[PDB]
């Protein structure tokens, strides 16, 4: 019911974007392909970790989950 965009990076539960940026920074470099092509999914993992960060600055995705997945803010 949406993904846990806090765990996908992996930070102190649901820490402010203040610390999420810090998770995102470590994890982004860790999961950067940097010629680890062919694998392809590891970059996709960086895509998820980006997605996570990005949802964590968004509006609706960011709250509906936090309350209740998508039975919160479907108006």
Curated annotation (Swiss-Prot):
It is found in: Cytoplasm. Changing residue 34 to N: Loss of ability to bind DnaK. Changing residue 33 to F: Loss of function. Disruption phenotype: Single dnaJ and double dnaK-dnaJ disruption are non-essential; synthetic lethality is seen in a triple tig-dnaK-dnaJ disruption, although this depends on temperature (triple disruptions grow slowly at 20 and 34 degrees Celsius but not at 43 degrees) and strain background. Residues 2-71 form the J domain. Induction: By heat shock under the control of the HtpR regulatory protein. Belongs to the DnaJ family. The J domain is necessary and sufficient to stimulate DnaK ATPase activity. Zinc center 1 plays an important role in the autonomous, DnaK-independent chaperone activity of DnaJ. Zinc center 2 is essential for interaction with DnaK and for DnaJ activity. Interacts with DnaK and GrpE to disassemble a protein complex at the origins of replication of phage lambda and several plasmids. Participates actively in the response to hyperosmotic and heat shock by preventing the aggregation of stress-denatured proteins and by disaggregating proteins, also in an autonomous, DnaK-independent fashion. Unfolded proteins bind initially to DnaJ; upon interaction with the DnaJ-bound protein, DnaK hydrolyzes its bound ATP, resulting in the formation of a stable complex. Homodimer. This is Chaperone protein DnaJ. It comes from Escherichia coli (strain K12). The lineage of its organism: Bacteria, Pseudomonadati, Pseudomonadota, Gammaproteobacteria, Enterobacterales. The chain holds residues 2 to 76 of 376 of the full protein.
């Amino acid at each position: 019911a949406k993904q846990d965009y806090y765990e996908i990076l992996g930070v102190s539960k649901t820490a402010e974007e203040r610390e999420i940026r810090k998770a995102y920074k470590r994890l982004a470099m860790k999961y950067h392909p940097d010629r680890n092509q062919g694998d392809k999914e590891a970059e996709a993992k960086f895509k998820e970790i980006k997605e996570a960060y990005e949802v964590l600055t968004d509006s609706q995705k960011r709250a509906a989950y936090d309350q209740y997945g998508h039975a919160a803010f479907e108006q």
